[PDB]
Amino acid sequence: TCPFYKKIPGTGFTVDAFQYGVVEGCTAYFLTHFHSDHYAGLSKHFTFPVYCSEITGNLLKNKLHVQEQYIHPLPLDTECIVNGVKVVLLDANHCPGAVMILFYLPNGTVILHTGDFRADPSMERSLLADQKVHMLYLDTTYCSPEYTFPSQQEVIRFAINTAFEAVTLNPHALVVCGTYSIGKEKVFLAIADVLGSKVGMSQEKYKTLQCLNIPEINSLITTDMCSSLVHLLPMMQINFKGLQSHLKKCGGKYNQILAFRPTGWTHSNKFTRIADVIPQTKGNISIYGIPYSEHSSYLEMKRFVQWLKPQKIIPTVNVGTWKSRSTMEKYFREWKLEAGY
Ligand code: NI
Numbered sequence: 001t002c003p004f005y006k007k008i009p010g011t012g013f014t015v016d017a018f019q020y021g022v023v024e025g026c027t028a029y030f031l032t033h034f035h036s037d038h039y040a041g042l043s044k045h046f047t048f049p050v051y052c053s054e055i056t057g058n059l060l061k062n063k064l065h066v067q068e069q070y071i072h073p074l075p076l077d078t079e080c081i082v083n084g085v086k087v088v089l090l091d092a093n094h095c096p097g098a099v100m101i102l103f104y105l106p107n108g109t110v111i112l113h114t115g116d117f118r119a120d121p122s123m124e125r126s127l128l129a130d131q132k133v134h135m136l137y138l139d140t141t142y143c144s145p146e147y148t149f150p151s152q153q154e155v156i157r158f159a160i161n162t163a164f165e166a167v168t169l170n171p172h173a174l175v176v177c178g179t180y181s182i183g184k185e186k187v188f189l190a191i192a193d194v195l196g197s198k199v200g201m202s203q204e205k206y207k208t209l210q211c212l213n214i215p216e217i218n219s220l221i222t223t224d225m226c227s228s229l230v231h232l233l234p235m236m237q238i239n240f241k242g243l244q245s246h247l248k249k250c251g252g253k254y255n256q257i258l259a260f261r262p263t264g265w266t267h268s269n270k271f272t273r274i275a276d277v278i279p280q281t282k283g284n285i286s287i288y289g290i291p292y293s294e295h296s297s298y299l300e301m302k303r304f305v306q307w308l309k310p311q312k313i314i315p316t317v318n319v320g321t322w323k324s325r326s327t328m329e330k331y332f333r334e335w336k337l338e339a340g341y
Pocket of ligand 1 (some may be wrong): 033035094116
């Protein structure tokens with residue numbers, strides 16, 4: 001049975017609610033993004049209307065085989081009427097195709113559902129500037145002050161400079177980057193660009209990337225591993241064992257691997273600066289964990305909410321324990337007393 005924080009009151013709508021069977025009264029199922037915890041349940045046999053971005057619709061059709069007649073793509077930044085209710089989709093600054101949804105209820109209430117997002121001051125100049133929000137359904141993944149990490153631009157600068165130095169010292173080094181979902185594509189695209197290479201990958205991953213509307217993609221990626229000196233591998237292979245096994249397969253072209261694991265936050269963020277990060281090394285293999293986040297830091301979340309001034313907040317992440325719920329409620333009250341709403 002579908003929980004309450006996935007239902008939108010006064011509508012026939014649900015958000016990210018595909019794992020509960022037929023939801024009673026649901027006339028339209030919204031999907032914020034193509035991550036498996038949020039699409040869980042969708043397959044080629046789904047027969048109700050799905051509303052989403054163009055990019056998420058490309059992934060539902062090609063990767064999950066949902067039939068075309070049940071996919072309803074909407075443009076961003078555009079007022080649209082769905083089953084008699086005005087909605088707008090907004091860029092969530094999460095993975096490709098990820099949206100927030102603004103719902104204009106027939107009774108006059110306005111609701112924002114963030115989906116998964118990385119809050120940014122640019123959101124303060126979207127269509128959100130124009131009117132008030134009564135309820136905010138909020139991605140609270142990192143809602144605690146210990147969760148700090150750098151800008152995506154600082155993290156990319158570290159990765160490009162690290163990879164360019166290594167491969168200029170040793171032209172026979174291979175670079176490998178881990179992946180297990182869409183998102184974080186800038187990591188491997190920026191490294192391949194500084195090296196003057198296409199990125200090489202499995203046919204399955206190539207297929208996924210080809211759904212993402214990235215400009216000039218055909219110039220940036222390939223399935224011909226032998227032509228490329230930046231390879232993508234499943235995240236589960238980014239360890240000394242898996243990397244050894246990969247180097248064997250490269251036919252003596254390479255004598256060293258430098259590998260990247262984009263993570264979210266890790267406890268070494270509570271001590272070490274991006275600049276000071278060092279790898280784990282065994283022999284001719286080095287692995288860097290880099291803190292490339294597509295979710296709000298605590299400070300970015302707090303800024304967004306203090307600017308929006310919602311009347312009520314409903315968390316959508318970390319909802320399963322009393323201790324988490326109580327922590328989040330305390331920070332929401334601090335923020336409100338501090339800013340005066
Ligand atoms: Ni996500």
